FIIR2 protein (Pseudomonas aeruginosa), 2004 residues
Amino acid sequence: MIPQTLTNTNLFIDGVSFAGDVPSLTLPKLAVKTEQYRAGGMDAPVSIDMGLEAMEAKFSTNGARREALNFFGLADQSAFNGVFRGSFKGQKGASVPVVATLRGLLKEVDPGDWKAGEKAEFKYAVAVSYYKLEVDGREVYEIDPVNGVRAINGVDQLAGMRNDLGL
Amino acid sequence: MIPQTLTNTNLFIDGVSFAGDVPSLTLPKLAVKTEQYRAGGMDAPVSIDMGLEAMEAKFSTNGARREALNFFGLADQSAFNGVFRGSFKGQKGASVPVVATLRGLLKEVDPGDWKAGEKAEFKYAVAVSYYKLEVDGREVYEIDPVNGVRAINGVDQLAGMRNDLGL
Amino acid sequence: MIPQTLTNTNLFIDGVSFAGDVPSLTLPKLAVKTEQYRAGGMDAPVSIDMGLEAMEAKFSTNGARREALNFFGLADQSAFNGVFRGSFKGQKGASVPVVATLRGLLKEVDPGDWKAGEKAEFKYAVAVSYYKLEVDGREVYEIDPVNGVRAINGVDQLAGMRNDLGL
Amino acid sequence: MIPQTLTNTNLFIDGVSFAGDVPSLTLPKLAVKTEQYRAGGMDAPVSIDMGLEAMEAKFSTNGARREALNFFGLADQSAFNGVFRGSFKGQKGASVPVVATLRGLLKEVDPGDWKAGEKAEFKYAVAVSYYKLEVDGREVYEIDPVNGVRAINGVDQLAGMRNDLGL
Amino acid sequence: MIPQTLTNTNLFIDGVSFAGDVPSLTLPKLAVKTEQYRAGGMDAPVSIDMGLEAMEAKFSTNGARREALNFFGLADQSAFNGVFRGSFKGQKGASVPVVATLRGLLKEVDPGDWKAGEKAEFKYAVAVSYYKLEVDGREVYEIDPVNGVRAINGVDQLAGMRNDLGL
Amino acid sequence: MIPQTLTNTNLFIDGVSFAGDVPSLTLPKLAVKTEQYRAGGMDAPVSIDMGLEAMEAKFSTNGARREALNFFGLADQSAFNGVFRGSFKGQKGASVPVVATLRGLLKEVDPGDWKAGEKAEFKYAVAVSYYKLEVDGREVYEIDPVNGVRAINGVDQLAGMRNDLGL
Amino acid sequence: MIPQTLTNTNLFIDGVSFAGDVPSLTLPKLAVKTEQYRAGGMDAPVSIDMGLEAMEAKFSTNGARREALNFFGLADQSAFNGVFRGSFKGQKGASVPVVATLRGLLKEVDPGDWKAGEKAEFKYAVAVSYYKLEVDGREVYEIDPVNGVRAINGVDQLAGMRNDLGL
Amino acid sequence: MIPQTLTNTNLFIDGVSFAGDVPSLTLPKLAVKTEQYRAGGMDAPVSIDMGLEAMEAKFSTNGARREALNFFGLADQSAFNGVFRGSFKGQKGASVPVVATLRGLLKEVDPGDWKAGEKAEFKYAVAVSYYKLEVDGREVYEIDPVNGVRAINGVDQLAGMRNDLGL
Amino acid sequence: MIPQTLTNTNLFIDGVSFAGDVPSLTLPKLAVKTEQYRAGGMDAPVSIDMGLEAMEAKFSTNGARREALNFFGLADQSAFNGVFRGSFKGQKGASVPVVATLRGLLKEVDPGDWKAGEKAEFKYAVAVSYYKLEVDGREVYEIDPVNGVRAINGVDQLAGMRNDLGL
Amino acid sequence: MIPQTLTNTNLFIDGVSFAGDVPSLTLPKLAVKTEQYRAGGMDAPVSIDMGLEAMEAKFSTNGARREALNFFGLADQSAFNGVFRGSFKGQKGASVPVVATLRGLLKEVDPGDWKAGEKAEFKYAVAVSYYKLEVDGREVYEIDPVNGVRAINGVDQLAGMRNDLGL
Amino acid sequence: MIPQTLTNTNLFIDGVSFAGDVPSLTLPKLAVKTEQYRAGGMDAPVSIDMGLEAMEAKFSTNGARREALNFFGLADQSAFNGVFRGSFKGQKGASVPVVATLRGLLKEVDPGDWKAGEKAEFKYAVAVSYYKLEVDGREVYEIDPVNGVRAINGVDQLAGMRNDLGL
Amino acid sequence: MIPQTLTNTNLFIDGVSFAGDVPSLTLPKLAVKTEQYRAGGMDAPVSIDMGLEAMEAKFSTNGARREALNFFGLADQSAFNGVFRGSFKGQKGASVPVVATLRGLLKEVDPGDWKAGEKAEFKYAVAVSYYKLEVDGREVYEIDPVNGVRAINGVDQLAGMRNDLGL
């Protein structure tokens, strides 16, 4: 119960600050692989959580930022680290930091149309292999796909699966 | 026969009020699985009610509302409760409350593009496993898919199906 | 040879007047299942009338109109009656009533985005099982799919089919 | 020399009309037992008419139509009567009735997969012991296998065989 | 070599003039069934004329014009006659009449959204079984699909096909 | 003469309800061992009813339903009971129960491909040693193979055979 | 060396034109009874021409065309005459007629599934006892199986066989 | 290195000038059938030139230009000649003529919506069977598909193919 | 009576975890050698349990997993152990482990088509000589073919056979 | 080590060029009659070369190409000559001619379904009695079955067989 | 951490400067063929780098630039060289050159609609067979697909692949 | 426990690299001749290893690769050597070489349909007489059929057979 939204952002990659060239910043969309499930004895289908969808982050630059141009197509996937920061200010004089540590693959580099008097707008896309979202210094999520972590507030929801499969 | 429409809204999740951060609120669309049916002796197809479609609610926030960010991807589906409220005011000085109790899965979390001076606009989607719509304190609907309830004004339309299938 | 168009409308359901809450009214589209037919000895295909398409009416409300919210998903299909009225006024001071009696299924209920200061705009859709259109008090059409009626000005075009099939 | 095809159908069994539940209707395929015949003095084989193949009709229902469910496996073969009707409409406003009186055995009852929100689609098959096809009220064929009738336009083609065999 | 375009139009159906209610008039699009043909010894494909596409005219009314509402879905296809007229005026004071006699099926009737203070805009579509276009009183085209006519300036281009097929 | 089809289903085994896990339900196909019979003096073969074919039911589950996993390969054949229920709803508000009591052998258990994010889809097959189909509470069939029952509407068609063979 | 293909077709039977109802037309496939022959002193088998295969034409109708429905199963084989015509148009404005006179047996009549709003598609098959193919008014082939004719451009290839066998 | 672009255009067909009615003129798009080719030993796919795509020109008129209305659907494909002219003026006082001789089929005639006070806008499309583009009086291209010409500045790139295939 | 299905899997061989490379996992199909049995005095055949069919498991890898590539074709059959694990999660927050201990022969290794930018998809097949299925830590089955065990819930159904044969 | 593939083709028969009508061209498949051979002292079978399989070429036309329609069923087998040409262009500007001289029997002529607005697609098949494949003007193969030639790069592999058999 | 973007551009082809006619310049998009990979023991899919996607550059001209009009469809693919230059100026007085040497195929030439008083806007597309991007005189990337180079800052990421495949 | 799959491939034959023309590469399938064995005292059959199946490799080219076209049908079987290489890259920056040395017979050469603008796709098949698979430089398998070798990790599983048979 208070107005609040984004006011400013910033991007870190390999400790390098892009405070100055992140026009668009995108936190990877989160979804589950809902399988609409209808069986006998039930009229209306119910969705079932059958795991997460593929994550994909995105962030853009307007200049030839050789840092994060040199992380495309590396053989060492998951070497592309990253931190998405966002400053959420309420109505009142209070600021909520939001942090999304990423680690994965710089999937794509898509230089837009160079129109000779218009912004370059390099679009990137990242295929995420690790996702930790923090709000106000507190863990909200932590995915680790390959290790089987899906944590909510520090509670791994997948502990039962890990027990069933024996890691 | 009176003008009337929405004037203001509010969202409750787990008793927490979001009176202040619900720019877009969406009641789940309702449909039936009409199978266009044409047989011999009839020129034009007739639709047949073969059950309901999948429900999906949606609601959005602009700030890192840790409540309802921490209900994504939980193992305990249907733990995501929810109440969609809407205040319908007529022309004259009268107000009609509309309430849609929900219970299901927080299917999706889709943080929009962070553009550094624009609203964050976190989009969520909910896969609904229970739907009770009330208007002016009176039951309009109640779905319970897994138990086989499709009630209109308190009249379970599926009672014949439940008798035929023996629960 | 006179200008003329719609000026105002109204909706009846179960004798209840919605004179006041029908922003959009839609008469069900009418089509035939034309099968583009080309055979030997003819260069260009000719369409063949192989029956009608599925009908679908639509009408919307902005308030929680409990009448016609309580006709969704009823087991008794074709209990959803309905009358679409439209007042066509010419250039000169004359008014032509257009009436489309409907009877079928309230197929769908789709509450739009509740944006907290914008109209609700409940979208409905109806799967029609009976369609009688009247203009100026005169029968233009009457479909009855299940009985095999497709009348034009009172002339059942399907009488030959009914004779061939023996009802 | 006119476009024409099927527009609508209907099924009668024991005088009961299934005007409403015949999604697929199949007239029994007709063939002769061609024996590809090659002899001395001829390069290319010629087919010889050595009688008809087995007939088999088919028709389907989507509901538990107790009429024609209760004609399976009866001891009294040929008690399963039947009339396949089809309304062939030309391009112009003319309708040609096609009628295939059948009489034989309800050979098979094959309820399809009940998928809980999909049509039932009971498939039947009929082993035919009598076949009279009529077009526009005129006899086209009449088979009577056991009596040795194969009539074309009222002309029993098997009269020579009946004379040779002495009935 | 002179500026020229459409200035005004009119529609006749069954001799009835709609001088007053034809907001949109559409002459049926004409195309050939080009099969992009590439063979050995040729690099680039060449299109081949393999006959015409299906024709479809369209015209709209804003009032309940009972004439041409009563020609939908008639059993007698090709009873829907029609004349599309268009007055092409040059720069100089000269007017070129364009006439497209049509005859076919009123395929479709699609009453637009009745918005209570907006034009009705009944959309129709016609499946054409005969097309004669005239410009300045002179035959430009004449299709007759079922008889195998595709005339240009009175020259049936299909005469060779008619000779080959023997009508 | 009314539209009607399946809307929902359910399965009972040993009184246990699987209202919730029967994606596909299959009633055993019914056929007779038609021997296409051609003799002297008849041109076209006639099928003869020489008894029924082997029955086989099928039903599937997506979870490890230990009930009906523990009925495979039991020494006591015919201990696998079962009830296939199906709710056939007409167009109008009426529901027709269909019941197929089964008793036989759980012939087969075929766990589909486990694809790590897709339904399990355990396929079963049942070899039926008893089949009673009921529609709307009325006996349609009753097979009892080993006792020699083939009843239609309560009329054992095999009574003549039982008399001839002396039980 | 010119593009060319089929553009339109037509069928004659007993002088009756089916210019209007021949969706699919099939000229009988031609083959020889190649016996793959390998002997001593040769590594790879060579095919030997040991006569022709059985011919079979096919053509279909969508309406109850009583002409060519009344030629099935006639005692007088080879009374079913027939002419398959095809208009082959090149790229340039030239048309090549192709004609296949047939004479044989209407082997088969296979009415497809009547689906109540879909084409009937009567499939026929013809067992051919005479085959003359003409292109551009010139004899390409003439088979006469029973008389021992296999002519190419008017040259009976079987004259040596006829001499050897003495007719 | 000089500014330059289109300033004015014109169309010739059969020597007739349409200096006055060519609002939109389109030179046929040119492409090659690139097959994205990836093999062993190479990470990234390389496109391969496997011939040209289908060409299609377009040009429009607003009046009933009987010339080029009378070239649709002619049996003599490639009788539709044509010359697309365009005057490219630089910054300085110099003009570069661009000429695209065409020859092919007037594929399509698509009269737009006649809206009674709006331009007619007849859209045409041409299927091209010959394409010679000239700039400043010099040959840039010449396709001749059927003869196997793809010339650049007078150099047939397909000479090797013609040698390999022996014309 | 609860929704439930597979969400994730894992494979163990010789204690080595393939948590990361099991795209497809297949539990061996289970069947009995039903001999359709018909005798005198019974119309319809009854299936008889005459033992189990051959078992065959399958599992696939996309990388050269030297573990389980080195168990093919070993002289010591039944040295190929194995554990198929599957995590079945219900609707609610509960997880059911399913375990199938296997022991037999790695029958087959079938590397799919290596397409240079597509998954390798090594297909394996296992010929099973021992099968214990467990659900939720409880024995469902245990086959031991060579020792004559077919246990259901710990009850050897073959004890009578072992007594009859004296081990 | 260079990308390369087919770009265009052509067919010669009796010196006549079909540059324009060879949509599909097929070089005859080559195989050996491998007899999977397993003997004592060897675990795994080894294939043995026991001669070639039967060859069969194929090529198709869409028009009534009287040349190569008049070579079917000739008494003089091996009079059907033929040259299959194919232009293989690399990535770089180089073209590799591939030539397969054929000589054998036009085995089969299979006119596809004439669908009245679709390509004719005459399928042929050739039974080959001589096969010389050349690449870039160099002999790759030469079969002569009846003379016992199987040459690779001019080296008759069958010379030992010819010596053993004395021609 | 400094504002920076594109201010001006230029194109070189074959050493010819188009300083004056490059309205739109496009550097080829870079991506990897991510295969979303999910296996056992992991909830969420991880993308895998399986090589690069097809590259495609684009650049446009408004005048008939005979240079780079004469490089379309050349037999010698990779003869189309090219240099994309872009001047990135920061906030402060500093300029960063960006250079993308290209070499491949001028895939496509697409002259836009010539509207008689609007820019011509010739669109080209290039299929790239070599890509070296340089920023500030330093190598950022170098692809060479056919040789297997994917260099980052001079470090060939594909050296392991080249070792594994032996070039 | 790491994601990994194929990324790129290559083929060597006689030391010649086909780095550039191996669209599909197939390692020979490996199986054993399992004889499903059931005896007295055992309910369920057990498979027995009775030796290996026939091996068959496959690899394809799109150009006339005279190397490996000139190894078909050679008298000297097992002169066709070969090395199948595959680069398996994990998630992390590591590459696993897989090598399958082959030696046998080029069994088959099957040039696909040459469609004049589509890849040639020469399919080959190899009958293998020697198979050594290596992963990461380590011997996984070595078959030598004729010498009786079936090695796993350097351990000849057939040593007992060789002792029993005395070589």
Notes: Residues 1-167 of chain B form one domain.
